[PDB]
Design a protein around this ligand. Structure first.
Ligand SMILES: Nc1ncnc2c1ncn2[C@@H]1O[C@H](COP(=O)(O)OP(=O)(O)OP(=O)(O)O)[C@@H](O)[C@H]1O
Ligand SMILES: Nc1ncnc2c1ncn2[C@@H]1O[C@H](COP(=O)(O)OP(=O)(O)OP(=O)(O)O)[C@@H](O)[C@H]1O
Ligand code: NA
Ligand code: NA
Lengths: 220, 50, 552
RNA sequence: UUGAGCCUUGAUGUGUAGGAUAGGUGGGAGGCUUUGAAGUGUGGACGCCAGUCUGCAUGGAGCCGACCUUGAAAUACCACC
């Protein structure tokens, strides 16, 4: 219906610019939902090579528009710090297994600066879903209170696909397009900083801007 | 002339080699001997190569 | 089709003395191509595959793959350490991810203890992330379970040394296929495999995505998996498009043409010789140019050679009417039992084809029959006028450090075979090993010549009871027909284990078919009327395969 | 009359277990149809044959999410395939 309408409405065979169709995308408020942003990024790079896998985090001025929950499943005082600075739930090392088995849900990864009696299930229980805190990406750090920035910045896990495809949220469309620009520049900055050493062709290939039930307009 | 020419490369990492002959029929094994390397001035094991 | 996945430009290869196994081979393989590699034994197909895989390097010419394709090479016979179990052997091929998990344990120690917590860990974990993300990582257990179930591998805790031949080859195949390749070179992939595994393998290869180069001797498997055929007649590869049936006629016509051309060359040579032997007849020329042109006409011809068409099975002693009787045979290794409630009696002048699935007691039967194991019940009575010669599956007993003469003959110029005596050179040459070839090292040999020398080494006891355990392993069809002929004028008795239904159809007089739950059916007659007996006691069912997958 | 591209548009992807042909993370909760059904006929391609996909019709409207009983989850546009 209106899906067939947006089919002709979007003509992605033609190249746009970085902000040429933001108004046309905001024209897709007709769909009955809160219509979060799910931009897609494809680069000119191989992803089968083991060394080129990318994993990390970033920030954006407006937040992702979601409530990132990083429970303090650590030992010491990080749980106490999170209980007032953005901790979903406090779990001691003698109760982390139960706290995960019962309600292990969380918007962000768990918090454990030094209380790390186990990485979690040893079998993808704590790393399969991506909950393993990797300091190399940015999950680990020497700031106990810095984990509050995980929920106060909307830090996103740079998941990597077998074809190097990155899907991320940009502070849902409630923020205006002039606010989408200051997030687009930031995500491009982070993308350039995450550049692999082995590069060829063009360092970015194609970006698709859309909403949840929306159409993916090209960026070029 | 059934013996073919082969070269004893130096395993010390430098580029140096002797040259001898070997009947590849009767002895298909790979030669190795401790000879002298003038580049390093030490006795290193030399292994055969084409 | 636009590009190629592999290329070779003028690749030559020289063996001891001066023989060109390969010369002027300029071939390119495109992505998505399946190629068969036919030819006689000794042609050089295994050498060509080794060169393509990269283990062989000392060549002349260019050989090149594209700059990142994953290559999987399966040799003529795989090497395994007997100490490992199936699980350990597989973990040897998937070691890197297991090592990554062990380093996860190390890192969890370093992160539970405040020492080296962040100063020397973040930059180190790059590989720890990379290996797990690139491979399946923590999905290793389930992927291995699925692969084992799809290949019908033996149990995870079975010792490799106690594993059978077919199971050993299946384990080698699994270790090859776990490291997911794109180029797939196989040297006789269906060697010790049974019909079920062969069907699964050919369907998998047909459904494959990458490129496959396979050395084959099975016409049916070749015709079901390949697109075109490389030949490698004598240093020359002839890529032919089509099927086996047409290529056979092409080869026969080519051989006839070469025979005619050789005859014409001999005619010309003898005519110019009869001119040369003439006189001068005055102060005339005699033609130095013609003399040179005649001397140039001795370019030499490589006789087709190999081409084995006769084998020598020595006569045995006179054999009576009580050859072998087994009554109430029973065998088991632990809970699983191979043979139970088996009995039969074998008459004179019989060939008994033994068939069944992989790992079912076929070799254990021979070990029992010739003093090597002990049945759970017993009563395997041989005759008083029986002399036993045995030939097993694996050519491992002999050493790869002796020439053919020194190995077969034992260094003695006279060889007393059973009753009479024959010169060792003549005896070894009856198996197509001439004076030049009798100096080759056993380790410096091909697969077919290895099997032939195995047969010639163990058939010298002159006994009229042959126990052959898959002697048709890596023999070309010409030597196969030679054995088919030589097995019919041998007056004694033979028991042949073979998965080659076409081979056994020619010579089988009695059948020993294995079935489920340790059933060993004994039937009298050839396969042609065995099928009629089955159709008399008919049961119709065609849902044979499952054909699942390797990975998600 | 055809080949090779090259852009789209559809259509496809069945280990053991769970609803059962059951592809890589979406972003995520309901979209969807009634512009006329879940179903019954009806032609085709696949099949590992239980089925999904579809031309199709007098007639014609709730199916799936929602609950995870799994190594992975709900054929819910567009995704750069
Ligand atoms: N050192 C050597 N001396 C003599 N001949 C050699 C030597 N090395 C290799 N050859 C010859 O190389 C030939 C190539 O055999 P190779 O092992 O490549 O397999 P093939 O000819 O394809 O046959 P198959 O594997 O089916 O037996 C053999 O016939 C062997 O006689
Ligand atoms: N000493 C032993 N200990 C444990 N298991 C054994 C021992 N000897 C044999 N077996 C088992 O019995 C079987 C021996 O293989 P067998 O001789 O029956 O081979 P096959 O599969 O019938 O034939 P093929 O040789 O063609 O593969 C295997 O299942 C093996 O695990
Ligand atoms: Na080989
Ligand atoms: Na065996």
């Amino acid at each position: 219906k209106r899906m067939r309408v947006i089919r002709e409405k979007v003509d992605a065979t033609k190249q746009y610019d970085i902000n040429e169709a933001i108004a046309l995308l905001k024209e897709l408020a007709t769909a009955k939902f809160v219509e979060s942003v799910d931009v897609a990024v494809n680069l000119g790079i191989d992803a089968r090579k083991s060394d080129q896998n990318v994993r990390g985090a970033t920030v954006l001025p407006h937040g992702t528009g979601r409530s990132v929950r990083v429970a303090v499943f650590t030992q010491g005082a990080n749980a106490e710090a999170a209980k007032a600075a953005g901790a979903e739930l406090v779990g001691m090392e003698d109760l982390a297994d139960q706290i995960k088995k019962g309600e292990m849900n969380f918007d962000v990864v768990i918090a454990s600066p030094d209380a790390m009696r186990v990485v979690g299930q040893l079998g993808q229980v704590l790393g399969p879903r991506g909950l393993m805190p990797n300091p190399k990406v940015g999950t680990v750090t020497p700031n106990v209170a810095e984990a509050v920035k995980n929920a106060k910045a909307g830090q996103v896990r740079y998941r990597n696909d077998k074809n190097g495809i990155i899907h991320t949220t940009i502070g849902k469309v409630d923020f205006d397009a002039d606010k989408l620009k200051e997030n687009l520049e930031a995500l491009l900055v982070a993308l350039k900083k995450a550049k692999p050493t082995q590069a060829k062709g063009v360092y970015i290939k194609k970006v698709s801007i859309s909403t949840t039930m929306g159409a993916g307009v090209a960026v070029d | 002339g059934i013996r073919e020419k082969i070269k004893l490369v130096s395993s010390a990492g430098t580029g140096h080699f002797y040259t001898t002959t070997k009947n590849k029929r009767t002895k298909p094994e790979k030669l190795e001997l401790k000879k002298f390397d003038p580049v390093v001035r030490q006795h290193v094991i030399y292994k055969e190569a084409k | 089709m636009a590009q190629f996945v592999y290329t070779m430009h003028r690749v030559g290869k020289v063996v001891p003395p001066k023989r060109h196994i390969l010369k002027n081979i300029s071939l390119s393989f495109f992505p998505g191509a399946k190629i068969g590699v036919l030819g006689l034994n000794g042609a050089g197909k295994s050498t060509l595959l080794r060169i393509m895989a990269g283990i062989d390097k000392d060549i002349e010419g260019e050989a090149r793959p594209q700059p990142d394709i994953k290559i999987g090479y399966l040799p003529q016979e795989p090497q395994l350490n007997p100490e490992h179990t199936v699980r350990e052997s597989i973990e040897e091929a998937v070691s890197e991810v297991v090592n990554a998990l062990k380093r996860l344990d190390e890192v969890y120690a370093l992160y539970a203890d405040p020492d080296a917590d962040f100063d020397k860990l973040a930059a180190e974990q790059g590989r720890l992330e990379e290996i797990i993300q690139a491979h399946d990582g923590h999905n290793l257990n389930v992927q291995l379970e699925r692969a084992a179930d799809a290949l019908r591998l033996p149990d995870w805790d079975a010792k490799i040394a106690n594993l059978s031949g077919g199971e050993r080859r299946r384990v080698a195949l699994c270790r090859l296929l776990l490291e997911k390749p794109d180029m797939l070179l196989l040297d006789q992939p269906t060697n010790h495999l049974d019909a079920e595994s062969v069907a699964w393998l050919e369907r998998f290869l047909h459904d494959f995505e990458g490129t496959v180069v396979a050395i084959t001797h099975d016409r049916y498997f070749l015709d079901n998996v390949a697109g075109w055929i490389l030949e490698l007649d004598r240093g020359e590869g002839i890529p032919w498009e089509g099927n086996y049936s047409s290529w056979l006629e092409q080869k026969d016509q080519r051989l006839a043409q070469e025979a005619s051309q050789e005859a014409a060359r001999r005619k010309s040579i003898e005519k110019e010789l009869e001119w040369v032997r003439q006189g001068t007849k005055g102060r005339q020329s005699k033609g130095k140019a013609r003399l040179a042109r005649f001397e140039e006409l001795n370019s030499t011809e490589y006789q087709k050679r190999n081409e084995t068409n006769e084998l020598f099975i020595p006569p045995g002693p006179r054999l009576g009417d009580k050859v072998l009787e087994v009554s109430n045979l029973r065998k088991s290794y632990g809970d699983r039992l191979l043979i139970d409630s088996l009995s039969f009696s074998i008459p004179k002048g019989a060939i008994v084809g033994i068939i069944g699935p992989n790992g079912a007691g076929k070799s254990t039967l021979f070990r029992m029959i010739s003093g090597q194991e002990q049945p759970d019940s017993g009563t395997i009575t041989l005759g008083e006028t029986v002399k036993l010669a045995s030939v097993d599956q694996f050519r491992d007993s002999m050493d790869n450090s002796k020439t053919v003469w020194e190995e077969v003959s034992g260094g003695l110029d006279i060889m007393k075979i059973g009753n009479t005596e024959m010169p060792s050179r003549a005896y070894v040459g009856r198996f197509n090993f001439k004076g030049v070839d009798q100096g080759k090292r056993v380790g410096e040999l091909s697969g077919g010549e290895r099997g032939r020398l195995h047969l010639a080494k163990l058939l010298q006891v002159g006994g009229n009871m042959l126990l052959l355990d898959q002697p048709t392993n890596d023999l070309d069809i010409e030597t196969l027909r030679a054995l088919e002929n030589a097995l019919l004028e041998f007056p004694g008795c033979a028991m042949v284990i073979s998965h080659d239904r076409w081979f056994l159809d020619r010579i089988a007089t009695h059948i020993l078919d294995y079935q489920d739950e340790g059933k060993v059916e004994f039937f009298e007659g050839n396969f042609t009327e065995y099928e009629e007996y089955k159709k008399r006691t008919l049961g119709a069912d065609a849902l044979e395969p499952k054909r699942i997958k390797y990975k998600r």
